[PDB]
Amino acid sequence: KQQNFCVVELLPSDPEYNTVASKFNQTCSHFRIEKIERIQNPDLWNSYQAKKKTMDAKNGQTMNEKQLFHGTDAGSVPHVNRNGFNRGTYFAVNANYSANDTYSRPDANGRKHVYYVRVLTGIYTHGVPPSKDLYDTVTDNVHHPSLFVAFYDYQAYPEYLITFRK
Ligand SMILES: Cc1ccc2c(c1)sc1nncn12
Ligand SMILES: [Cl-]
Structure with missing residues (x-):
């Protein structure tokens, strides 16, 4: 109920650091990563896994989760x-979209912040979502997605925080 959390800074030698950095670096290699943090929020995580289990029981062969x-x-x-993205919320396939100064506003020290988020995209359509008993998310392009919009609580887990600069 409280959704208390811990912030664990990944050592550069932690395998997860290389893994998160590689995905970011597909489109953001020109930025300098200062740190990568794991967000540990047991209540938020449990709530997210509850919604994943429901969606996994619903959508058959669908790979319901994307990062x-x-x-x-x-x-x-x-x-x-603490809250994840509970309020819909825009998630980008590529980091360079989120890395725009409008979405990752540089702070007073020039530092920018992008999460690498577990999102239950489930079954989606072009765009609360419409009928089909609704779609799980809406996207810009059903066959070549670059962004997803989630409207439901506990549909997203802010697993990793990337702090970086120009
Ligand atoms: C239209 C739109 C709105 C918000 C948004 C994007 C695109 S990509 C991204 N990354 N974090 C937030 N956002
Ligand atoms: Cl904090």
Whole structure:
């Protein structure tokens, strides 16, 4: 109920650091990563896994989960670490979209913040979502997606926080 959280800084030698950095670097290699943090929020995580289990029981062969990017300002980081994206919310397939200064506002020290988020994209359509008993998310392009919009609580887990600069 409280959704208390811990913030674990990944050592550069932690396998997960290389894994998160490689995905970011598909489109953001020109930026300098200062740190990557794991957000540990047992209540938020349990709530997210509850919704994943329901969606996994519903959508047959659908791979319901994707790992997507979300840019935030520095000030929102404690809010997202506690609440996730519960309010819909825009998630990018590529980091360079989230890395735009409008979505990852540089702070007073030039530092930018993008989460690498577990998102239950489930079954989606072009765009609360419409009928079909609704779609799980809407996307810009059903066959070549670059962004997803989630409207439901506990549909996203802010697993990793990337702090970086120009
Ligand atoms: C239209 C739109 C709105 C928000 C948004 C994107 C695209 S890509 C991204 N990454 N974090 C936030 N966002
Ligand atoms: Cl914090």
